[PDB]
Amino acid sequence: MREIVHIQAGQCGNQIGAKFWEVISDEHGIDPSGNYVGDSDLQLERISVYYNEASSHKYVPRAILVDLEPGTMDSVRSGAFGHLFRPDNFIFGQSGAGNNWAKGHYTEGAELVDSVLDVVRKECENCDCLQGFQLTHSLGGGTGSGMGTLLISKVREEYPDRIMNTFSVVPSPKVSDTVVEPYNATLSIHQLVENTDETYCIDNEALYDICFRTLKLATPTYGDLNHLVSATMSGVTTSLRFPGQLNADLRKLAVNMVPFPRLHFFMPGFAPLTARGSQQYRALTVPELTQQMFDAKNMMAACDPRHGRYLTVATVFRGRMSMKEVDEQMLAIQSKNSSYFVEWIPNNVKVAVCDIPPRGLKMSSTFIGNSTAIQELFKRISEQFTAMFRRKAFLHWYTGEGMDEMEFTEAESNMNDLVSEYQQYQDAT
C-alpha cells in the first residue's frame, strides 16, 4: 500500500535514478534480473511501495524514465541494473533539449509529455492507493528543468491531492557547469513554487566538499555523488518502506516541514560519514550522529545555516537505538543553538525512527532542514539572472520558441517576492 511512482527527467535525474534503484534493490535483496533472492520477509512485506510484482514472481521498479536524447537512456539500458526496468517505460525523443528551457517546456516537451502522462496514468491506475510522486531532475539542464516543470504542472492538474517530491540539483555558487543556468533556474523555480509540495535542494559543490574533506577521497567520480544522494533518498523513504518504533510517511514530513505554502525548500544531510581508515577510531553513538548533522561542513546545500535560522528540522534515524537518547540529544542541540532556531516555533524538531540499518552499518541518520539561509542561494541566482537579463544576453534562443520577456519579468518578480518572504520570516518577532 501507499505505492510511490518514480519519475526521472534530464540526464542527471536519470543517472541519479540508476544509482538510486541500485541502492533500493540492494536494500530489498533484489537480483539484477528483477527476481527476489533476499532473506528477510520484511523486505517483501512492503516491496509493493516501489516495486510491482510482475507475473512469474518477478519485480519491476515503478520507474518512468524520461529524456529527449537516447544517449544516457541507452547507457542505462546496457549497463547492469538496467535489465529490470520495464522496457516500455523508456520514453525518449530525438531533437534533444539542447540545454534550453524553452525547448524543454514549450516546443520539444509538448510532443512527449502526452506519452509520459499516459504511462503515468497507467501506473497510477495499477497501484492500489497512490501515496505520492518523487521527481528526480536538475535545474540547469534544459530537459530536466523544462520537462520536469511541465510534468509537475500536468500531474498537479490531474492529481491535486497527492504529494509531490522533487530532488532538484541546484547550480553551485562558485562554479557554473552551464552558461545559461540562471534562466533555467529562475523559470524552474517559478514553476516549482507554483505547484510543488517540497523541494530537496542539492548542490554539487557541497557534495564535492564532503567527498573531499569528510570522506577523504581525492577522486570523486559522479558515481559517488549519486550514491550519496541515493542514500539520502532511501533514508527519506525507509520510514514507510520499513517498520519502526516511530514511523513516518511523506505526508508527515510535508505537514511538519512546510509552515507556509511557498516556503518548502529543504536542505538534506546524511550521517555518519567516515573515511575508510578513520572509522574504527570513532564511536557510533546517537550523540555522535546528532552532533555531526548540525554544521555547515555536512549540509548538502552550499550555504552556512548560521547565516540564518532553521525554520523547521526533521530527522529520520535508522537501526536499533534508544528513543530517550535521541530525545536527550535533540533537547541539548536545541538548547545550545538557541539563536539558530526561530523563536515562534517551539519544539521544532520532527523525529522519526526506523528499525533497519542502511545495510553495512549499525545506525544512520538523515537530516532535512527547512531554513532561511537558502535565501542567499536564491539571492545569488536572482542577481545573476538580473545581470544576464540587463543586457538581454542569450535572450534570442528563448524568445525564438514563443516565450517573451514578460515571462522573465514575472518570474524574476516572483523569485524576489519569495526571497522577501524568507527575509520577513527570518527576522520575525
Binding site: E45, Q131, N247, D249, V258, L331, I345
Partner: protein, 435 residues
Amino acid sequence: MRECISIHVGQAGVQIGNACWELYCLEHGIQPDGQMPHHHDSFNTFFSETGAGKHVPRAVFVDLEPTVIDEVRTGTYRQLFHPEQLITGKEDAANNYARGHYTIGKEIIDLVLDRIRKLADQCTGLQGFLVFHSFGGGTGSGFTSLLMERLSVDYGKKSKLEFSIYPAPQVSTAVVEPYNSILTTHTTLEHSDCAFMVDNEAIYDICRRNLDIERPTYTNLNRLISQIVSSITASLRFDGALNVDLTEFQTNLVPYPRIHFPLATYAPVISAEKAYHEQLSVAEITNACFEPANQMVKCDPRHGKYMACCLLYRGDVVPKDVNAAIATIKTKRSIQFVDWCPTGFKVGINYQPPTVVPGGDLAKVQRAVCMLSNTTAIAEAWARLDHKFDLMYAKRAFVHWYVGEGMEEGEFSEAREDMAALEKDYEEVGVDSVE
C-alpha cells in the same frame, strides 16, 4: 460479568496495547494462542471465551496506517486477537488533526463503531471504555475525538477512561503538537469521564534514575504504563479485601464536570540488584508515591494542591498500615490539599501481587501501589501548551493544512477560548474560600 472493552487508537495506543495484553496473558496463565494449560470469573471481565479453550481479548485495534497493525499480525501475538478487530486504514492522518477527524477517519469510523457494537452486545455487564491514545499524533487526537463523540452519542451513561500521552514540555517528537493537543482537548473535554495524564519525559527520568537503565526503548515505557493499567483493573480482575470499580474512580476523582485530568504514578520501581537492601515498607512505598520525583508527569506537585487521590494497593497488604501511612501523609505540610476537600483519599486493596514479565526490567515485589492523583499543578502545564499555541498561531503557521483539510480558523479561536476557560477554572478552584 463486569465486562470492559479496550480501544487502541494510533500507533502509541497499539504499542501500549501490545504491552498490556502481554501483561494480561501472563497474569492469568494465558498462552499467546488463547489457551491455558486466589483465582476464580477473573479473566471473563477482559477475555471472552469460545467453545474450545481459546480465549480472545475484547480489544479493537484501529489505525489508519497498516504498518504497526501488520507488525502485530506478524508478532508472536498473532493467534490471539480476533482478526476482524484489527481495523487498518490506508493513509494515516500524518500528524494532522483535520485528516484524523474530518477526512480520513470519517471513512472507517462506521466500521469501528460496528465492531464496538458487536463486542458490546456480546457482553452483559459492560462497565466502560478504555481508550489508549496519544495526544500529538494526528490519528490519536482526531480519531479519538471523533470516536469519543460517537460513543457518547451511542452509549449515553457509561464509563469512558482515556490514557493520553501528554506532550512533554521540552522533548517533542512532533512539530504540530500544540494544534493536535488543543483541538483534541477542546473536543474530549465534554465527553471523557476521566483521562489519565502520562508523559514520556517523566518515564525517561524514572527509568534512568530508579531502574538504573540509561538507554531505554519504548518497550520499557510501554511496560510501565501496562503495569499501571493492570493495577487499575486488578480490582475487577481479582478478589480483594477492598475492591473498587471504575464508576467509583469517576465519582471520587472528579469534583467538577470539566476538571477530570488526574495524573498517574506507580511504586515501587527498583532494579533487580537493588531489590534487596530495602524491605519495601507499605509506608515507604506510599512515601515513594508521593515523592515529587516519582510522578509520571513533568509537573512539581508542590506548585499545586492535591484535590483528590486514589491509591490502589496489591499484594500482602494490611489495612492498618495503610491507614497509618495515609495519616502520616496528611500530617505533613508540603502535601497540602484544598481546604474544601477534607477527605482526600480513596483506598483499594487487592490480594494478587504484581507479576513480573520475563525479560523485563523490574524486580519481583510482594507489594505494589498505583496512585491516581487529581491535582492543580497540571494547570500550569496547560499554560505552557497555551503559550506554544499562541506563538504558532500568531504567525498562522501550518494553518493552511488544517484549513484545506476541512476546518476553519474560527474553530482554532474557539478552542483557544475553551482552553483559556479551563485554565481560568483551575485557577478559580485553586483559591481558598471565605467565611
